[model samples]
Target: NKAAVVLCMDVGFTMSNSIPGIESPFEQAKKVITMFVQRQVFAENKDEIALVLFGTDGTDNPLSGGDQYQNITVHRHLMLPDFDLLEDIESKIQPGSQQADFLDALIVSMDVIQHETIGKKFEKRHIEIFTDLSSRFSKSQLDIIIHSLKKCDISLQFFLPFSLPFRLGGHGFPLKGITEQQKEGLEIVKMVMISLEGEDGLDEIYSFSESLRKLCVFKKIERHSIHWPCRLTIGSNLSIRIAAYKSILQERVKKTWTVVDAKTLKKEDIQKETVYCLNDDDETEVLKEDIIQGFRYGSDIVPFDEEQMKYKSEGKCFSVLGFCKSSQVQRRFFMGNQVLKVFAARDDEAAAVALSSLIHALDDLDMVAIVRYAYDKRANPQVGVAFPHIKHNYECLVYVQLPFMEDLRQYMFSSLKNSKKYAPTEAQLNAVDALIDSMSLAKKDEKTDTLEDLFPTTKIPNPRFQRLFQCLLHRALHPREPLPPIQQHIWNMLNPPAEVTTKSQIPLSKIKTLFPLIEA
Candidate 1:
């Protein structure tokens, strides 16, 4: 499904101020916006985005010109996702000379989306506002905007460049930094956010100034069904099919009303019913008959028994012929009184051992492992990788998964079909070697305070290193006598030599530091 999103950007005077050594907040917002648009465009071809600028000059406003304090303009009208359009919007993001009215900007953004998606039913609609949160508006006006947002079913997300600086100290100190008026204003904004974003949505605020590079990365949660392409063995025959299952929670609501007077009525009885329905109609409809339902035991597959297959007839069964990875299962353990109690299960012990070994191997190699996991015995399994890190006083593991990677393929020099013969220059090869050497020393730092601090190594700006990596992989696969310089060819393809300009002003110290970069 595709989404229609409007990026509401604030360009008030406050955004003009540079944050210490970093760029201005307006510039940072533009970078974040560009990154977001690029991600959305690459991830989903159908997703469309529009850039709307608030607090720009009133004279050239796309929307009707208002007072300097309430000026809200559309820098780029709602349109399909285009790189050129994104660049154009980026060029136009300048600091506004006047104050901004967030409420008016939001209303204008909502109106744009509402107008664009009037007759069409979009899969998703959102207004992602990039602001410093310095603007203030009336409570009643914000309430009206919130009501309109709910009516349109459009989600509002605010990406702020600053953090609320009203936290207590390590001890039980009182919150005394912020003034009462500032606190009241923040509370009102919080109420608006809750009404539009619901609970937990307020955490989306990103302090771009504090954590510069962190704003560029987007951590997506994988919630889609997995596609399992594998062979299903039944008796002596082997068949291939894509297997998958979906589980849904079924609930029933019973409401009874009793007549009291001619105009008034009261509820008599209200009952709630909950049921777990594991349906296969959707899955089976598109699948072939060769798809035989089965169970996954460790690395093995086991077909269901005839008695157990009865659920299939009842239209409530999950096929587990192939395992799909998923995010970590959130489980809560409560402390209770018991006389030397030990609750253990065979499957649980086996799974724990397997997971522990996987984690150990990953730690030894300084690499991450992606595993296929099943939360419940009967539930469909998901594919995800467990990221072990220290949280608070204990080591915590966070699991995340790619929604789908079946269609994705790694870039390989051998995979190229067309005609192209090239090799890498000595200088480029030296650069590649240097990159590998740097990567080897870039081990995971567990003692880092913040997520941003974890990745302190500077990135290799040259694209030749990427090509060299692919070339190495190709050499491993095809160990022939005469090998084409795949890395050089890739570099040529990426950047033609005619467009490249060589520099002879290289530092002698930097040249001395350059050696066979990769040790191995």
Candidate 2:
């Protein structure tokens, strides 16, 4: 089971109001939707996307009544994202009628979301609304609509462009003629937003312009597209077909440089020059085919056999051994730089049904299967844990490579006990422990107000990758001008979270007083 997102847009004429330099809010909304669909397709997510346009000329969809839901229409039905869908959206989206009852549009979109996804219990329902927040909406049926969303379990987010009326911040622009009506609309919007906040599904208001700007620069996310098929064997007769995909990317970056022309500065391919010469003062060229590798065994030279030198490796296979308690799996046993997402092979319903039951059993017992895997005959066999994933729903495993016994490194040092050489006093130890406890990364979430890891890897961005982006971005925009310094935001992220630092200061001083530091 995966996500089911409904991109609901306000086709109201208010969306046509231009923001200087950038495209109109309506145009930006189209681009945002296109980018959203494109990303899902590239990510190989089996998520369903439903595109809806409100304030259109025609009325269509299951919830549309004769005169009540007048202008809403579903342009594309819930379907998997592909080139056909992307092309259809790119060519079809255009400015429509000016009037749209905001509340009615949202209620209609929710109707589309609830019916399509609820049939299958696993799909996550979400409706992303893009509006100028200037539409006149009545609170007549708002209470009932709000209750429906809560019962249905769907998330909602509003993209308000500058939101002109709220005048939150940044280069404030007033393009409104009916100033009195806009204020009234803002109050109604505020109540709806406040009520939706901290509900079952996530709800928030985001700046449309800011989101578009981010999409323009930060759309270089790597694809989740690598799918490899293999037979997972429990024994001779019991075999399950499964496919693998690159799950998460590790921080270790790839480095490579392309050659460029001197004058035009265009990217050029480099033909690496290589030549073998004789040891004598004479120039004698040697062909690479004639050069043979030899092994030096002590004082004797042994001719190398290409076939004999190759390491013993089995063909592509995902063989499982036995299940073990997940608690028994040590953190050190997770060996690989990145892991694989193992799912049942497509078009194999038998394997899918079998794996589903297997996942249920493993998850019920809180255990993981020890497995041996290989991509192909050319690659070495890998040993790892195939832990079942039961989030939301479905059968899948997060395969993490495990380390060998000899691969484990053990460091030795003197014990911090009653000693003379490197003895730490009780006061010092306690102070340090207090400092460690105070410096905990647990932080209160903004919307949920629940404690979570304050500085998670997902929240943080690698400075090097961002630096590379800004550098290229500058060159592409202003080729002649010298590159600017690193942005302030990048430098700001170099330190620990401020909330954690704030708590650590008191314990830090006590630790400092207990143990003196020797500055080099």
Candidate 3:
């Protein structure tokens, strides 16, 4: 994804002071900003950045030589971030500039972003300010800056070398403490940060002064390539094809344009004409183009056109033969990274029998089956785990793909292996049963609340268990043949024993036998 970022740096006299032998804050800020720009350029291909400086002498100032008390000015205009420009900005940063005008710098940053992103579709616009929060500004001016940012849908980020001394307390206070004027200024800045990036926006502040040697590095999550191997059934015959897909979801927009009459007219009769250039229309029409209905072959996308294509039956079917891990796939389609599991259709009697056996096994074991299958074989064969649907008696699933193993390996939980066999205690079974019962009886508005109250903590199996229970419950109620398991381990763990739940509760001694790991 492409993005536009504006780096607003404070070059005031306060930034020039060094702590002992360490480099000055202004020098450190320049280094961090350069690193940020470089990373954005190399890591995020199309992302760009610009630079702006405040608390420096303006050209209009009559005083010659270096001065530290001048209005905000654009150090570098909005452009694609480059190493040469970064070096230029770094050399320009000096300690002689006056106190910065926080509001003026913010307004100019917003203007730069707007000017660069005008008429552009789908860009992550942002303004990142590197400051010590030493500048003063009023609430009304801050409000205007925030309103402008919101209007342009621009996200704001601030990087501080030290924590803001605005927290209310005695010992917790700074040596000088914050003045009433500074408090008012910091309050609005905090509000703006939270408003733009949520409650954790201030988390960007770092304890860098304590450890100047440790550089603060922000790295984006790496994306990996994926290749889905499956059998595409056209009529009766199945053909093998590698699928590459991307998401086409975009932000909803409503735009209008007005034209004033160029011809001269009577003052009373003169008027303007308005036209809606863009508005909300039926999404189906847009989806027809957005949704992928084919696979990649060689260098081309072989689209499955209903009218032009011929098939054996009225509809088509796709079967998942298996998948192949790939470093790269040719002719890739744009799909966002989402984890999905694909299941081959249970068209054969053997497959159907296997599904039936699995379903019965889950029922005997007091477990739920949250399995989903492909609807139209012609469509992408991505399958999602089923979750409970309010209106429907059975569980519902959506198609989504999973991220690659490389990406998964980065998470802490990724190392935890799936249990070879899982058996629930009588209490756990009863708890799950109670959850299912509550879900069916609870009103629509209170369903979520009921589930939360039932399982207040992670120690107790939560809604995920509820979802699985409901999946099996719905299958039992509806009485449909279960789908064959595409993944064996998942199916084996989900398989139930011959024993079934009875109205009478099992003895605590028996419960201990069921789950030896459970705490008594």
Candidate 4:
């Protein structure tokens, strides 16, 4: 007989009650509970059972407090329960459409399983809590109930039957709203599990107990391994032949298997190799000497420096960085060793001149060289640098209308460090500070309504109040003003229209329409 068992279920009165927004809460609960029960019954070493029903009163048992149907323990006497149990379950259970205390019935079912002598013999235990509509308990009370259930590895499967039409009034989809609640619940559950796991890790002996609990309660990968092929030696003390493809790496190996002889080599030995050649002579054959001689001969030439003249004569000259043929600006200017490229779309002419000046300055300092230059179609200042012998490069991309003082500060600091150059002088630091102050003052004047002197007192408000004010001010000053629908919705929800009632009276339900759903 297998140790597996099944839980027969019936979503009682609490699920069948009529709620304004909920369409068919009872059926939703039934389906969700059925799926969960089936899953548990199919698991190995788990008990399997079937569902039965009675009248609405029989299913709920409001007076008897016997809503749960798990009391008919079929696993007690048989190692493998007979199919007759299913028949009994079918005959006894019937779907009922009536209102009753559903939560009380569920709690009783959990109790029956927890205390059942026959159920204790099985290796695994599971309970499916199916319901619709929020619970009858207050928020704080529900928190305690949930905590207890979690401790016992009990899970509740909610089947919401409500159709929220005007979620505080908006055009947003309602499907996402339900999913978000589930997601948030799952995250909180994970956090609780993580905390339990951490506590279990404190002691070595308790670790085994924790492992067993986690295995039974949580879904996780347990056993995993990789298989390796076995090999045998044909003879003892056998010498293996080894071949050395390259002598440089010979000393780095523990074993090297080789062929018997090298004298059998042929033109096509090992892998074959093919050579590729260009049709025309390489243009790089043009000598720098020709360009130098042409310069001496008084020929009309571009006024480039000696270094530029050398590369141009040698055919290593490139216009817009790298070996590319395009009318794009490849050259970038650097302030010292830092590469600079601006992406300003409209100021190309100004950018080119600024870049030329910066490049000339770096060239005079002999601290940098242009490895490759490429124009950005994005119309922004983008500077990059590369050393001829190094494989790495760095670039400083500039965005238009952005505060440049921060960029300049970071660029100068990082460039000086990378190039092993001296730090900025006191005069340079003073200039940078002045630039930052000027930018800050200008922005403050444009965005803020209150003057700096408005904060005459030393005491400050609480952080929450301060943050709220800051947010409000930011919203007031933003280009779009307040956020369209979201801001309006939040404000309405938080601060509704004033009540103009002439008379006051006590309502039948203390909580009004949103009264909590109770079982008993």
Whole-model lDDT values for every prediction: 0.51, 0.71, 0.49, 0.32
How many angstroms is residue 133 displaced in model 2 relative to the true structure, after the best TM-score fit? 3.8
TM-score of 2: 0.58
Better of 1 and 4 by lDDT: 1
Q: Largest TM-score belongs to which candidate?
A: 2
| Reference-based lDDT, residue 70, model 2 | 76
- Model 3 TM-score, 2 decimals: 0.41
Off by over 4 Å in 3: 42-44, 59-70, 119-122, 164-185, 204-520
Cα lDDT tens digits for candidate 1, 59-129: 33444544432567776766667656555645645678875677677777887898877776577788877
Write the residue-wise lDDT of candidate 2 on 428-488 in tens digits: 8888899989998775767686777754535444566556645654564467999889754
> What digit string (tens of lDDT, one per residue) describes model 3 on residues 1-520?
5667778887777778666745566876775565465445443356666777777766322221364224666667666766566457555456656776676677777877887677665356777777666767544566677777888888776665555611110011262554465556566677777887777766544432311222233322123334343433323453323232222223222223344445652354566555332246552333334555676898997776475665434233333333222222211421344433322232444443443443344344433322223435454433222111212232111234333334344435532335435555567687656545433322335665554222122222122322343343335334576732232212222322212122213444444454458458
Model 2 gets an lDDT of 0.71
Ranking by lDDT: 2, 1, 3, 4
Position 247, candidate 3: lDDT:
22
Candidate 4 regions with alpha-carbon error over 4 angstroms:
1-23, 33-46, 49-55, 59-98, 117-119, 134-159, 162-520
- Candidate 4 lDDT by residue in tens digits, 1-520: 2222223233345445544653344544443333233223223223433232222443322224343432222222223333343323324443454433334434444444444435445444334333332233113334544565556644332223432232221111243544454344334433433443544312211111111111222221112222211111113432112111110111122223444336764434556445344448883444445543333336665444455543222121112222212122234322332222322123345543444443344444433332322222223332333221111342112211212234555443356644646565565555555444433321235447744321211121122322343343345346376633333323322321222111111222222333336689
Q: How do these models rank on TM-score, best leading?
A: 2, 1, 3, 4
